Each structure stands twice: as C-alpha cells, then as structure tokens.
Amino acid sequence: EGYQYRALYDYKKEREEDIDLHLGDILTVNKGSLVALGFSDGQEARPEEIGWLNGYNETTGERGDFPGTYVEYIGR
Known part of the structure; x- marks a missing residue:
C-alpha cells in the first residue's frame, strides 16, 4: 500500500535532492519513505501537512523529494 498525489503547482528543485516537479505531475510516494x-x-494523504515527500514523478520518469504543499494525495 503506497501513496500517490498530484502536483497542483509546479516546482523545479531547490534542495540538492528535489526532482523537477510540474503541475499535472504524478508522484508515487511509498508509505514507508x-x-x-x-x-x-492517513497522515500521508495530507501532504500539505507533511513537509517533504519522496515519490516517483512518472510524468518525467524520475524520482526524488518535493514540497508536499505543492501536491495533493488522492489515494494509493
């Protein structure tokens, strides 16, 4: 059982571990990381209240961390 959110806003990569994020980008964040x-x-379903999440940006076929306030968990 992992977690999958949608990036409502667009992000580039400020920290040395973020991934190019963009509105409409899907992020497959496991429930362990x-x-x-x-x-x-259920706390993982509320990214805006998490800080940073590490998932897989299938949109760009990559993976990394990103601001949870820029996505919106919608289910695994």
Missing part, C-alpha cells in the same frame, strides 16, 4: 518518522495512518 514518509512513515520513516512515524506518520499516523
């Missing part, structure tokens, strides 16, 4: 801290069940 984010729960590695102990996120509560």
Whole structure:
C-alpha cells in the first residue's frame, strides 16, 4: 500500500535532492519513505501537512523529494 498525489503547482528543485516537479505531475510516494518518522495512518494523504515527500514523478520518469504543499494525495 503506497501513496500517490498530484502536483497542483509546479516546482523545479531547490534542495540538492528535489526532482523537477510540474503541475499535472504524478508522484508515487511509498508509505514507508514518509512513515520513516512515524506518520499516523492517513497522515500521508495530507501532504500539505507533511513537509517533504519522496515519490516517483512518472510524468518525467524520475524520482526524488518535493514540497508536499505543492501536491495533493488522492489515494494509493
């Protein structure tokens, strides 16, 4: 059971670990890389309240971290 959100806004990459993000980009973020801290069940569905998430930008066929306030989890 992983997590998948949609990037409502566009991002480029400020930190040395972010991935080129763009509105309409899908991010496949597993439920572990984010729960590695102990996120509560369902907390991953609210990226705006997470900080940073590491998923897979299928749109560009890449993977990395990105601002959760720029995406919107919608289900696994």
